[PDB]
Amino acid sequence: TALDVAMRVNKLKRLHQTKKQVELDAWRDLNNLTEAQINSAEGKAVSLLLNSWAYFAKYWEKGA
Amino acid sequence: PLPVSYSPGSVTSTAITAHCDVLSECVAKADELAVQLKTQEGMEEFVEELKTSATNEMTALVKQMQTTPLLQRAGMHELRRTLYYTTSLKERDWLEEKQYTAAMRMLTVEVLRRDGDGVLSADDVLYVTTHVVTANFYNRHLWNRMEKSLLKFSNYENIDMSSVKAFSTRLFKTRRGCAKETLDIRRKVLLAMSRRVGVLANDFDLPSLLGVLQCYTVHDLTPFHLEPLAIRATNHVGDFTPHECATLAHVLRKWRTMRLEVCERLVERICTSDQLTHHMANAAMIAIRTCFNQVSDGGRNAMNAEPTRQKLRAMGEQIGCRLDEVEYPALPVILSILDVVVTLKIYVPKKCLQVIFSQANDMVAIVMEQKDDPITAEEGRQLQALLSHYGNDLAPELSQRMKEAFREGVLPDEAS
Amino acid sequence: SHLSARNIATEALQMKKLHQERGGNPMLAQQARRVLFATSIAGQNLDARSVALLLNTAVYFGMESDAKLVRECIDYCLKNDKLITVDVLPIVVTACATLKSRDAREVIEMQAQKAARNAKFLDAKDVTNIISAFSKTGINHEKLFAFLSRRVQTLARVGEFEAAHLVILANAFSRLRYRDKFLFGAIARRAMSLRERVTVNELVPLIVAFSKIGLKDPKLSKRFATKAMEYVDQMNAEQVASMFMAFAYFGIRYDQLFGVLTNRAVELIDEFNAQYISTTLNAFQRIGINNPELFDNLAERALAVVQDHDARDISKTVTALAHFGLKDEELFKRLASHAASIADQFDAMGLVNTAHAFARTNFLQQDMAVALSERSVYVCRLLDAGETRRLLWALAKFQVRDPKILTPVFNRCLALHYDFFADPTGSEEIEEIFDFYGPNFCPPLYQLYISRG
Amino acid sequence: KSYVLKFLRGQLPEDLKDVNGALGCLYGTLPDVDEFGQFVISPDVVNSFHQFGYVKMPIPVLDHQQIDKLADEVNELANNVEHHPKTERLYATSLADLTGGPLFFCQGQWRAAWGMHDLIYLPTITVAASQILNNSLVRLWYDEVFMKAARTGPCVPWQQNYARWQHTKPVNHVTVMIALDTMNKDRGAPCLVPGSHRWREGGLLPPVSYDPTKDEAHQLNTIWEIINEEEGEMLMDTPPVTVDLRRGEALLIHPLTLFATHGNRSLDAVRCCFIHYMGEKTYAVQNGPLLPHTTKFQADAMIQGPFYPVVFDPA
Amino acid sequence: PSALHLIFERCKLNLVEFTAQDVYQICTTAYNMDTLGMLQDPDFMRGLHDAFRRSDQTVISPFQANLIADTFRKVGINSMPKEVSVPEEDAISPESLILVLRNMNITKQRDERKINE
């Protein structure tokens, strides 16, 4: 589901906050999501993914 | 063979008549159980039975009117009676909110349709508005159209004698807690049909005159067309009880009718009471003061000013000597009576002073000792000053009591 | 550019003033509507003055109780009655006159109950503005007006007011139907003790109001008549028409003044428009005085200006011409043809009066006949017994006999049948109706007619 | 002209049909006579409408700062606590019973509320409607709106517009539909057959049956009842297609096209508007008012009056 | 990106179940960094505003609600937090009335009736 990947990416982002190439990790999870998970995900997971997305994209090489 | 949809407002009928008869029997039986009271558990089961038979009957009736077209074929009197019951069963709470809202919506829709048809008569507008605003149901278009239809006074010259009494009594007894945005409409209902009351002024019963005057006064309305009624009160004053006479004193004062002779004839009935009550004493004192202000020294009749003032003081003493018999509900009554006595220079017996000041002391103890609920600091100032003028011996304890109360600052200012 | 809400309020107030009393530029109205349609007050934080001004200006420019700005202002005026001092009371009270919602009624009653507690603690400007604003709405609070009446009576004994104060007070008190003799006596006393400071432009409306109130007194009426003599050569057409209307309301045949005013008005025939023509003829009908030579000139001038007539002007002119006997075929044809296009604008009075006046004149156009007859179904609920009887007689002379038109009229006639059959002025008027229709039309009405009564 | 009181000189008449022009609300005002030539539509869109029976505009015709105001007006028109003023000037509304339901509609609302009065004269749709009607004058007939309820929002079955317009002698109309919110097949976007306007040589299909309680799918699969084998083969050739619309997009349709609209499954309401135009050379059929409380006409009288104002006139 | 587009579309079409804490978190992350377009997509903000208005606000402190209203007003859409009711019998205490007054004062909307009560 989406809640578990959201929590794992949140933990990885928090550990990053407290880093070389680590941004590749927890970015594969964002590329992991399929539609069927999204059509039934709750809003808590969505907010977590959005926050993690922004925090990662602060330092991404190219694109977002 | 033109089609016409007019029906009399007071004859043919549909089953709505039968349902209304059932509901009338139900409410009559409720009042009959109340009569049996005047046990409790003995009637309580029957009260529940009446509530159940009202609720099921309402459900059946509303379903019947909703499912099949019966409103359009119903006559006017059935609509009036159904509206009356739909309100009265809610004021004496028996109905659930959703049922009441749905029934009111349907009745208002049909009434607006009838008004569009134009079959509405002058009496029906009065009945509908008086039994809608009292229940406080807000429908914008119905209210606006009824407000507009009350501005044509000529249509309301032929209202029956019982109709005015019923509408006035209904609009009077619900005044104590009326909602604000309904006040104005009330007045219009009382002004569109005032002229009929003015012409009928010679036919009302004796207490009905006082009732109508009170009903008009509580709505802050004193139209000139109703001035003859008050005049009649000045003529037939010999039939009223002292309480009614005391009320009539204030009513007359509010009608600008208050003159010297009417008060002079008025005071005797207040005197005839075996035991005085504070309303009568206050009314007598304020009337005496106003009629003392009535006489003019610097005027075209400066020959008998003092011979009239001495007479007024004479009655003033005659009512003052009996002031010890009355209970005083609150300090402002005491202040009003003492103010009249002082500014009019009426002697009072020391016994009445002792009773007044003892009652004031006992009443003023509570607010000070309980440190909160009220008496303004000004009020304490004048009370202390009144005793100081009249002497400490009236209440040798209340002197230091008020002094200490002012020292602690337990009486806040009026504008605070 | 973008500005704070207070600057918007100030410019809106100036825009309202310019539109109201310095020429009606349509561009100003359109620009003000554009600015006020896209402005909200929730975000900012302003005192009662700016919010009240915004509400007043918005309501003036045709904003009903549905727009965002009106609701935003009204909730504030509901929740902060204590912030409404005597300064801002008249502005809000005026602003809530046209609105007839629930919150507007409650706000108005709150202000009314607050006003009759600070009655003793007012001054000249606040008293004037408060009484005019309360006269605007249509409230029926007798005690409030009595409390203000005592205050004005006391304040008049020291002589502060100017002419405009007197004009405003007289107009506002007259429009509310307050027949207190002593108040108007003090008003007149203060007016007559102001020497050379009552110009005709301020004199005439005071006379208009004093005529409209309806107190019965010939002495001050004669004083008014004599005082108006010296300015007879100074007014224009509008003031002459207003004087005619006011002295018709007075109801005293001051023949000298009527003569001199006629000799003045005959010179100013060219400046007369339709409104003055209708006003003069209506006043002459009400007073009951025949002045032929003037009537011919007015009729010809009205013929020249037929296109400018409104519903009120036609309903007045046609009634006056029918009453006075002076008939013009071409003028009546033009009036009927013009009223054919304006058939929708008639109110309850105008439709019935025009139809009856046309019916009695035997000038029955057919386009006007159908145009006016079709309209009767819409308004039939509003009319009175006598007006319905007159309309029915006019329709019987119109020879329509169409159930779609006739069905609501008979229902209303049955509705007011007590007053319908108790009108001596027209006891013969029902005979032609019931002759034309016959017993086969309305069995209940016919049964009641045949009955004794 | 009678004398208007001092504090009444800026108000507006009860019915907004009288102000012969657009109020200065929303967009500023009408452009000059020469400035009307920039709103023209590319011919490719015209051929696409001719082929498919419907077409979408390249760009939205409204901006969010105006659509929010329009939605505010739509929400206000639905109050059941304080009934919207000028209610009596509408043709017909679902709130005439004072109860309403899961669907809210009002017709001829341009006579009741500001802003939406100005919508009628918006050049970006009126000039397109003029181009669709073979470059002639245009006339408003009547405007209505739809607001679906929450996730219990019902749907509208298949229908042909002209089935309600028998009073008009020729088939010379057009319909513009505005999406006041973001719409989707799960929210209430419309679905219409891309060739139903070219069937039976312009004949009118038999009316469809429906049930007020069945699920949306059953109401959608009742199309087979009307069509025949010949229309069935074209249905296989041209399956129905649903178009999704964002805030401010406009869709032009043809009166002979079959159309339907899904229900509402989202968490809130959704709003849309339908405006129907005429061209010239349009005449009534019977003697009477086309709409309640409107002008009466003759059996073969040209349709014109106050209730049907001209909007755009080329040259 | 692809999944970001799907998440945005699901947010705009208003099928997501959003609670007030989630909208507060999204408003904060858009307010402070906005690396990805949040304040520049009007439909996204409209959907978020609808979700906030329909959602229960009783689970947030007054300051965060004020922050939500402030970040809503910046992009060009009006917004006002829902008002609060006086507590009932058992919920009365010296701490809750001060909360009522504090919420009244913070959100810049005042009322005399609640003050009197």
Question: Can you describe this structure in just a few lines?
Answer:
The structure is cut from a larger assembly and holds chains A (64 residues), B (416 residues), C (453 residues), D (315 residues) and E (117 residues). Chain C has helices spanning 5-21, 26-37, 48-60, 68-79, 89-95, 102-115, 124-137, 142-156, 163-175, 181-192, 200-213, 218-227, 237-250, 255-267, 274-287, 292-304, 311-324, 329-341, 348-361, 366-379, 385-398, 403-415, 417-420, 429-437, 443-450.
Question: How would you describe this protein?
Answer:
The structure is cut from a larger assembly and holds chains A (about 60 residues), B (about 425 residues), C (about 450 residues), D (about 325 residues) and E (about 120 residues). Chain C is about 70% helix and about 0% strand. Chain C has 25 helices and no strands. Helix content of chain D is about 15%, strand content about 15%. Chain E has about 120 residues and is an all-alpha fold. Chain E is about 55% helix and about 0% strand. Chain E contains six helices and no strands. Chains B and C meet through helix 4, helix 6 and helix 8 of B and helix 6, helix 8 and helix 22 of C. Chain C: This is RNA-editing substrate-binding complex 6 protein domain-containing protein. Chain C: It comes from Trypanosoma brucei brucei (strain 927/4 GUTat10.1). Chain C: One of its GO terms (molecular function) is mRNA binding.
Features:
part of a larger assembly; 5 chains; B: 416 residues; mainly alpha; 67% helix; elongated; C: 453 residues; 25 helices; 0% strand; globular; RNA-editing substrate-binding complex 8 protein HEAT repeats domain-containing protein (chain E); RNA-editing substrate-binding complex 7 protein domain-containing protein (chain A); metal ion binding (chain D); Phytanoyl-CoA dioxygenase (chain D)
The pair of chains with the biggest contact is:
B-C, 35 and 36 residues
Beta content of chain D: 15-25%
Main beta-sheet strand count, sense and barrel state of chain A = none
The helix-and-strand class of chain D reads alpha+beta
Give the quaternary arrangement of the chains. part of a larger assembly
Number of distinct helices of chain A: 4
Helix and strand pattern of chain A: HHHH
The strand order across the widest sheet of chain D is 1-8-5-10-3-2
Cα distance spanning the termini of chain A: 23 Å
Tell me the β content of chain A. Answer: under 5%
Distance between the termini of chain D: 35 Å
Characterize the overall form of chain D.
globular
Cofactor (chain D): Fe cation
GO molecular function (chain D): metal ion binding; oxidoreductase activity
InterPro entries (chain D): Phytyl_CoA_dOase-like
Organism (chain D): Trypanosoma brucei brucei (strain 927/4 GUTat10.1)
